[model samples]
Target: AIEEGKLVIWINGDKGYNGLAEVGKKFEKDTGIKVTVEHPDKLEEKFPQVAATGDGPDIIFWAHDRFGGYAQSGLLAEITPDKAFQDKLYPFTWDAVRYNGKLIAYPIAVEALSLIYNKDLLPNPPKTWEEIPALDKELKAKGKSALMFNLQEPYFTWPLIAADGGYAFKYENGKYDIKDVGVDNAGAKAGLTFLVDLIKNKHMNADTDYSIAEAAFNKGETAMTINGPWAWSNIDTSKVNYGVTVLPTFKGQPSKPFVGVLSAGINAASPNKELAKEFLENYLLTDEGLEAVNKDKPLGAVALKSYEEELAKDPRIAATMENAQKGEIMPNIPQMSAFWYAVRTAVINAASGRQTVDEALKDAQTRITK
Candidate 1:
């Protein structure tokens, strides 16, 4: 690559393949460095193995949750963006890409779970999850469900269970305290039971997967579904009068979903780290470059300052940005992998009625500790 003046990038999926390839071509023409953009067949399975020996692409693109594994494993180079670049970025995006106070990735877009309601069915969405019970009775009369989401997955359920002070890990002194897992604490217990009561009271369904939830909302069969822009195209095509806002409070407490980010990072072992960094800062983060890379997805909200005004013109996307301000970034720690299984198991147990809420959460805490 050094003698050939070329760079390689691994992007998650094919979100904006042609657009990025176009940008790569433009960048290469301008800088005398040829760039290749490719989506591997099985990124999660292969990236780690290749990166360990520094035998991967110069740049890697993925969500911030994978930051810990790459950064801690010394697979990624520390990014120290200059003040000018930092000023050009949305401040909250920085939060998503940083770990242990070190910059690990370049934030490209911002997203968070929100309350998506059919405005025709419910003029005003519930202000709190506490209001669901009464609304449930009314919706039942019409054969509709109050709220729907992928109940078995933590990405949706954790936000509700974490509404009342529950946290994945404590963030202190500029880093996450991975040892302080919070799912089984008093707040989480209350949050978990609050969810179990909803299932017991028939306010939501135990089998509402992402596909089911979105399908029901698309058909106007459900009043609300918790989701983001990734699920909006289907609903938009369905042509329902809908509205989007931050997650309703859980039992009167504000619901905070993970403010996830999609980003690109430079490989520490790559001889082209400087070239990759140069490309990211000069082109990828620029308005022209960003537009190209994000051609396929509705960025929801901009991570870079230049795209905000244009993207915010859409009310739904703006609502996500508004909620993202109130949301916390996903914890970036190596041990964070252990947190997911416990949550999935706990939600499955309580929602399936196979275990009491107390035991469900207790077992979750019990598993994460070991």
Candidate 2:
């Protein structure tokens, strides 16, 4: 019971928050440590302010894969939870939270994008990115236009970049190698080409928003879309007969999921550092703590190895573990700030037919550096 050392943590506004709040409470009850969690209405508004003042919450749950910029700027602490300790972590899940020679964050939950489709529309998910065009053509012949992607949304672009051996940034010589931006990588170029080809073939509309795509999927107007599992509650699985699987590979490798492992991080600046770490270790990493994650959040967990027996009963969650190894850690380097703007612009420009794939990337490479 850490009654004397209350740790106030801030959580983000995401699907996983509600359950994690329950987890936090359970942790508090078990340990008697006052684990105070504050979920502000606007996480975007709150985080920057905390960062500016150096008074941020002890832990925050976010898409850790995208933390490269925050890490570069020294916002995170190096936990370096032993690999021998973390090797038990599901495959590739730890990469996003580790950075430039330091294990910075404690990974909590793992999420990956998948080809969510109406099983009525697709008895089987496409086996490769190469299969997409043919799948689109077949959908069209059946009078169904297939699929949606926020061509301008960076969240979608992260994986397309990975499909081609591209990453947000290259770490070299103890710092970010801005020279190795992946927008120009051949894998990235081909990924962009594939998207543009989709638009050119009239399978997707450049103007389609994510909401419109979801509405279309629900109405059975579209066959599939790329999205995370958090959308499960809103989508009607029974009526649609939906299914999911790894996004198809390019060059014979499965497209690596841009994994963001939700983690509880102790603020080095926090006065209650020891209690905070103990609270996380006992409540977030223990078997009972993970059981709550698996049973409640039920999406996926970074501490999955401890719960393999429990996970095997749920097909969807089990598949998430099996494919967990296929995900790449989203980096935590600061220069990764450029990634948000650059990757989407390159892909969107190509999809809109406004530029060749290479040209779009060339433009992004220049834009990101500046």
Cα error, candidate 1, residue 60 (Å) = 2.7
- The weakest ten consecutive residues by lDDT in model 2 span 293-302
Off by over 4 Å in 2: 1-6, 28-46, 66-68, 78-96, 137-143, 170-176, 236-239, 251-253, 293-297, 312-327, 353-356
Model 2 lDDT tens row, 1-370:
1223677777764454565566678867776766677778766346555764667776655667545555655665667455466766664556656665566667666767777777888888787777888888978888886677555576775666667676666768765676777667788777767777778878788777767777788778888877766665556443787876667777786776666677655554566677666666656676676666444434554455776556556555555644455756556656555766776777777777777888988898888776
TM-score of each: 0.85, 0.80
Q: Candidate 2, TM-score vs. the true structure?
A: 0.80
Q: Compared with the true structure, what per-residue lDDT tens digits does model 1 show for residues 1-370?
A: 2223578888855256567777789888888888998889767447777888777788888767878777887888898797878888877778778876789899887877788998988989988888888997889799887888888678787777788877787878866776677888888878878888898987887888978887888989999999877667567679998888778887677787877787888878778778888888888778888787656545567677777777788878877876676667786676666777788888888888998778988787777776
The residue pairs that clash in candidate 1, if any, are none
